[PDB]
Amino acid sequence: DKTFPIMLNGQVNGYACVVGGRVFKPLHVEGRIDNEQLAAIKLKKASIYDLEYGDVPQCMKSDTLQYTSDKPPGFYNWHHGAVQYENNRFTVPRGVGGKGDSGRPILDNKGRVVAIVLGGVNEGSRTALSVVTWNQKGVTVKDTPEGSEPW
């Protein structure tokens, strides 16, 4: 797995992570990408999408496995423990999921990155997030609960 922080002013401001099929960088924030191999790659950002085009030589291509439909409620391994929910983002503990750690992938226990967080700072006594994943049939759609800011 290659999940890389983004270098801004010599400190971490983002967190770039490569995914199956295409290499991914969260283009919501800026900062020089730490990896030198990615340091010479053109940027392809859409109006609302903040994703890097996949231009890694196909030796290390598809570092991960993408995620299909049929979301279970079960455990998804997160950087800070497992997450367990199905209707929307898991009720992450308070304090966790704040700010400054943009671009963190949530993966299945089977190695299938279910979604990519793009904010969702607080959602009450619990907290869900604003993320993007396949819609129902494999459509890269973002869902943003109200009160969502990059985390």
Partner 1 sequence: QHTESFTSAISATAWSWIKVLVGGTSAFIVLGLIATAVVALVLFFHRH
Which active-site residues does the annotation give?
Answer: 28, 50, 102
Q: What secondary structure letter does DSSP report for 127?
A: B
Distance CA 48, CA 78 (A): 25
Q: What secondary structure letter does DSSP report for 133?
A: E
Q: Which of 70, 125, 139, 146 binds partner 1 (CB under 8 A)?
A: 139
> Least distance from C-beta 135 to partner 1, angstroms?
5
Contact 84, 93 (CB under 8 A): no
> Least distance from C-beta 52 to partner 1, angstroms?
20
> Least distance from C-beta 140 to partner 1, angstroms?
8
Distance CA 129, CA 120 (A): 4
Q: Which is nearer to partner 1, 18 or 114 (CB)?
A: 114
Q: Which of 75, 143, 145, 147 binds partner 1 (CB under 8 A)?
A: 143
* Distances from the Cα of 127 to the Cα of 26, 95, 105, 107, angstroms: 21, 9, 17, 18
Instruction: Rule CB under 8 A: say whether 135 interacts with partner 1.
Output: yes
Q: Which is nearer to partner 1, 40 or 48 (CB)?
A: 48
Q: State the residues that interact with partner 1 by CB under 8 A.
A: 135, 139, 141-143
